[PDB]
Symmetry: C3
Subunit: 168 residues, 3 copies
């Protein structure tokens, strides 16, 4: 049998796991919100401060959080509306300070002005993120993905874009 | 050090928080399901019964749950298929009976008949909801949002809508 | 009042419920990932091994997990890109080893080659799943759904599909 203290110890471990899972789901939510909102300084706070990290998605690789946000600010300019919509996470806490997260991504991109005016891009991907916990806080260290599909097309210029946060 | 009783107290607070977070995520799920299903009486049960509430999204404002559902029933008639798809919540429990929830919304609207026949509307938004807990149950009090984008367009009438719950 | 032991018992029940809810959300995530990835052997591991189960969605009915995956492999061939995107779950744990889960589905299907080349199908549905727990593990037993809508259309062959995991 188990004493009351043993049962408390078990509960403490279980609750810590659930708390970590929830913290990670909110971290990834914040990442997507900052990414699509183009809130680059805030997005930087989701990335690990441990610069032993190579900040990579398996394709693109950078050596600091600032390098990541400098790339993104250039790659995702005001003329590009983006939606990165995460679904159905599978978060595994791997240790006291490491974890893995599978996410099912849908992405939609719309170029409103410039050289790529009226280009639309839609896709899907399976991401597997790696996270680390530093001084009580979870951060994103790196990821990899399989692209389910991606399509590029020209949007009808007669479509009426009635709202655009990057103009308003 | 902490006694067993102190450790139990800590666990009770942590579990209550996680339970509240889960209750809120299910509440918002029910809201979207009732909204798109046009189950207006059921949707009304998700809204706070505290009529000190101004029921607002920052744009539209009503003074009771019934006023909200009367508006929605008129604004979202049988001829309008709607999908409001929530993603990546960030739920913060603010007190014993208040909370905040960020949600990443995609919306798709299709008009099948009437004056707006063949109109499609797609968009995205960042919502920040406010919730309150009354007699053990969570309710939605009000929200605000930033529209990421919105587009209006005419759908090809050659598209075959093979299923529509609002006709069947 | 409650003794420390009673308070521990209450916490054990609450944490087990939250653990079950999280296990179910990850189970359904795995189902969708395997479905769209066409990982049929892995998908089979999400289905209940209890063959007193009729494996049904209310429309299609099979009598073993293998029959389910044989159907799916034929129905969802390499020429069909699929995305089944789950949102906003409402998971109810019904007993120590049974549960119910509402899911808000968006589906997108694209045929790239064959007889249905350039067909696209988009839809939405409200699913209510039934789960069972066998030897510590949750499985999907069966489901039912209401189709919000479904549309069939021919895609412009000028669209550029730049990535497709089922060719790569
Ligand atoms: Na979508
Ligand atoms: Ni979605």
């Amino acid at each position: 049998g188990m004493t009351l203290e043993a049962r408390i110890e078990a509960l403490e471990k279980e609750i810590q796991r659930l708390n970590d899972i929830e913290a990670i789901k909110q971290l990834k939510a914040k990442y997507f919100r900052c990414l699509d909102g183009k809130l680059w300084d805030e997005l930087e706070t989701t990335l690990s401060p441990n610069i032993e990290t190579s900040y990579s998605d398996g394709k693109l690789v950078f050596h600091s959080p600032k390098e990541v946000t400098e790339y993104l600010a250039a790659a995702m300019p005001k003329e590009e509306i983006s939606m990165h919509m995460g679904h159905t996470p599978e978060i595994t806490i791997d240790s006291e300070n490491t974890a893995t997260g599978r996410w099912y991504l849908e992405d939609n991109l719309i170029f409103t002005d410039g050289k790529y005016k009226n280009v639309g891009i839609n896709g899907g991907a399976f991401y597997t993120d790696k996270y680390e916990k530093i001084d009580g806080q979870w951060y994103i260290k790196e990821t990899g993905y399989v692209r389910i599909f991606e399509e590029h097309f020209m949007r009808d210029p007669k479509i009426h874009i009635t709202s655009n946060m990057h103009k308003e």
